Amino acid sequence: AVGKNKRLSKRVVDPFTRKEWYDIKAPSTFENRNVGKTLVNKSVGLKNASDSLKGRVVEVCLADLQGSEDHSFRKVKLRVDEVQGKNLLTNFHGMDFTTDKLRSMVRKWQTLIEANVTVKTSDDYVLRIFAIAFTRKQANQVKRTSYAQSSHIRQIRKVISEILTREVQNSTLAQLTSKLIPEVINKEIENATKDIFPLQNVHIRKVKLLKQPKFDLGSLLSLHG
């Protein structure tokens, strides 16, 4: 189609010859330390390529970093911070679900439970954690809904807040992520809330990094290699 008239308000080259492949290395928390590849323009001084990479973020499926298929719904945002040349170092930047799992997960005739929390980890990491849970029809049920009274929501949500904030304000990000990969926090949540209401399908979604202190080179070194 020629459509556009040419509202102007052939210098042809091979643009991808000026580009190169760099490997991806993930923190030791995940089993699969190598993630994939990334295309970067060649190192031209004064706008070096190394500056070009630093700050790149990426979405990677958690199965690809664990190899298992019980993690078929989670994804991790990784942020590159270090450059080695022909190999790069990425830091954990956040966690999230897949949209499909979450939309399938919310259902008619059951009240969902959401909890926000802003926390400070052991070192400096200003984080925010989102918790999603759902009520449960007990295995005797003939009253064929599973609604919860508002007071029970306030109680359960306060429990969610205390558990998340207590767990997270103890450890650095790495220990937190290693706790997260098998969701010990999930199990403890359903354990501490089952007294109030059955509260099925508890999970932790969309864990976000909000602030990091300066550079922390040594820890990132320790997490890769």
Partner: protein
Amino acid sequence: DNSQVFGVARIFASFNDTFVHVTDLSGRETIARVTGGMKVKADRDESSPYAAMLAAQDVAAKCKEVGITAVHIKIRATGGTRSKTPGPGGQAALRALARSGLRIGRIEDVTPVPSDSTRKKGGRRGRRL
């Protein structure tokens, strides 16, 4: 992993002029931007499945020659306030990528969802065609 050089499809599929635009796995470097309107003329077949097929084949050729072998696919409807439904060309483009050599992994929907805010275009009674 036998060195499948992953890429990402990031299909955008509206009621009008579906988009296929491969970037790096980081989602920063463009590969084969070629769109739905590139390979169709009458501008009405912009959303037609055949448009998606043709753009998909062009992307497949360029992608295979640059080096990306496996492609991660994300389908995006118009999203935002607008209509929430995947474009008719999305299925055709996805099928066409699936056939043409490039391997597929981790397809998910990326269509944004608001919290029903920023009142939708149309007025009260809306489009009264």
